[PDB]
Design a protein around this ligand. Structure first.
Ligand SMILES: *[B@@]1([O])O[C]([C]C([O])=O)[C]=[C][C][C]1[N]C(=O)[C]C1=[C][C]=[C]S1
Ligand SMILES: [Cl-]
Length: 359
């Protein structure tokens, strides 16, 4: 499949998508034959008439969780934490007896027993954060029910960096971003970079993400399409990652911990076995499945990375919608960054269609 044909397949999928979903701007990377290929469409900022470029910063939303998963894996590989350890090992002040039996694994993979999708808006400091988790009453025993949640993996990422003594942003930069040369990926956008920051859009209004507790760990990363392509490349082919603990952390994040229907839960990353049909992946992305509390089948010991996987993550904020998927066996992958949050099934369908052209 030539560069020219690939550019046509991308244009012919994305242009109708943007029209149908009222998306002002998109940046796309396709990973193919050892390198990224970049396609940019529309506007980063409508009022200012600024085009999307390969340097335009997008809000990743929950694709931030893949960075959380890999940083946590790296901590495991340094010997600083174990997924088998009790959450209370890293938070001794968390004295409530309901936390017994809840492992760092459970926090990382949404199986703690019903931690909710969000940290409540009244949580504004450490005292309030502690109170929230102290007062939480699990609806299910640990290791029985997956409920996708910021309050779960968010807390995992905060606790994962504690033994290192490093704050979370610092740990992420030193241990994940810098070694991979992701030098335009930000939890907090510096002043000097602000001109690259797209506006998000919802129902015609410009919007950007506001602060919340555990945001950095759950939904706070911003990045451009070059850094995201290289992030996808590193996760798709970790054999080329030099730092030993980081390479193992990447493997840990794509390891299978639980089966839930047709999908498997990694650390941030989710996986289906390849080959998989589009309707299987599309159906799973629907909110009525994706947000539901669902029974789990344990994968113990965790299964190491399966090369024949569809590996993916969707993420949104108020004004952005992003999606990434890759197939390590085929060495193909895609990044779709957009400045409006459009339906996840639509992201999956487009990503699957483009990657199908490469098979
Ligand atoms: B995150 O982006 O993940 C999505 C995944 C999906 O769409 O199935 C859903 C919920 C949690 C995450 N999103 C949010 O927390 C919403 C926002 C965060 C900041 C502003 S809105
Ligand atoms: Cl600690």
């Amino acid at each position: 499949v030539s560069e020219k044909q690939l550019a046509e397949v991308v244009a012919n999928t994305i242009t109708p998508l943007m029209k149908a979903q009222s998306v002002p701007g998109m940046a796309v990377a396709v990973i193919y034959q050892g390198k990224p290929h970049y396609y940019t469409f529309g506007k980063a900022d409508i009022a200012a008439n600024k085009p999307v470029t390969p340097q335009t910063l997008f809000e990743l939303g929950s694709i931030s969780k893949t960075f959380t998963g890999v940083l946590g894996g790296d901590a495991i590989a340094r010997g600083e934490i174990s997924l088998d350890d009790a959450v209370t090992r890293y938070w001794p002040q968390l004295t409530g007896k309901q936390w017994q039996g809840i492992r760092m694994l459970d926090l990382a993979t949404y199986t703690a027993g019903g931690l909710p999708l969000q940290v409540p808006d009244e949580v504004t400091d450490n005292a309030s954060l502690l109170r929230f988790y102290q007062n939480w009453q699990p609806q299910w025993k640990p290791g029985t029910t997956r409920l996708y949640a910021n309050a779960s993996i968010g807390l995992f990422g905060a606790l994962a960096v504690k033994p290192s003594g490093m704050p979370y942003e610092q740990a992420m930069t030193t241990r994940v971003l810098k070694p991979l040369k992701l030098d335009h990926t930000w939890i907090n956008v510096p002043k000097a970079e602000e001109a690259h920051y797209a506006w998000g859009y919802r129902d015609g209004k410009a919007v950007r993400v506001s602060p919340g507790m555990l945001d950095a760990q759950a939904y706070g990363v911003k990045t451009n399409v070059q850094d995201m392509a290289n992030w996808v490349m590193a996760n798709m082919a970790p054999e080329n990652v030099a730092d030993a603990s980081l390479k193992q952390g990447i493997a840990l994040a794509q390891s299978r911990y639980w089966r839930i229907g047709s999908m498997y839960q990694g650390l941030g990353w989710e996986m289906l076995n390849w080959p998989v049909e589009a309707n299987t992946v599309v159906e799973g992305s629907d909110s009525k499945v994706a947000l539901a509390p669902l029974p789990v089948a344990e994968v113990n010991p965790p299964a190491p990375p399966v090369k024949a996987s569809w590996v993916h993550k969707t993420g949104s904020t108020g004004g952005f919608g992003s999606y990434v998927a890759f197939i390590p066996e085929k060495q193909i992958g895609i990044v779709m960054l957009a400045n409006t949050s459009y339906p996840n099934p639509a992201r999956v369908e487009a990503a699957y269609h483009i990657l199908e052209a490469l098979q």
